[model samples]
Target: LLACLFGNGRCSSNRDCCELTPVCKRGSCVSSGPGLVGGILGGIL
Candidate 1:
């Protein structure tokens, strides 16, 4: 993912706003990617 969407930026979908800075979560721009909590906060609401 060379093209990044940064943080909290609005978009129509995940592919439109994810990578480099943050990941698309709950249809919104949030954070994480390197699997820091791959087994933790990832499964919670």
Candidate 2:
């Protein structure tokens, strides 16, 4: 499953990616860790 984290970048579900609170969006699985707050500049830095 570790290979799926940074694999080909294509996935059918969140289960196909990292377990760090993964979320499937736009056909890719990614970490949603700071997603909500990362959208803002303050959170980015």
Candidate 3:
């Protein structure tokens, strides 16, 4: 997840990370970029 890389490490909570997994735990849903290039491409889509 982008949150893992963005946060510079793995996390267990939404505060720890902003990835889909963590966000899902918070009762929220989000679809983030896969990687660096995918981030830019995801924005376009």
What residue pairs are clashing in model 2?
none
- Judging by lDDT, tell me the better candidate of 1 and 2: 2
Model 1 lDDT per residue over 1-40, tens place: 4666444576556666756435666666655556755466
**Each model's lDDT:** 0.59, 0.64, 0.46
What is candidate 2's lDDT per residue for 1-45, written digit by digit as tens?
354455456677777666653777788766666556456557545
Give me candidate 2's TM-score against the actual structure: 0.44
RMSD of each: 6.7, 5.4, 9.7
In model 3, the clashing pairs are none
Poorest 10 consecutive residues by lDDT, candidate 1 = 30-39
Task: In angstroms, give how far residue 36 of model 2 lies from its true place.
Answer: 3.1
> Judged by lDDT, which candidate is best?
2
Please, what are the lDDT tens digits per residue for candidate 3 over residues 8-45? 34445456555544442334434444545646545565
Clash tally, candidates in order = 0, 0, 0
Q: Which ten residues in a row have the lowest lDDT in candidate 3?
A: 21-30
What residue runs in model 2 are displaced by over 4 Å at the alpha carbon? 1-6, 34-45
lDDT of 2 at 6: 53
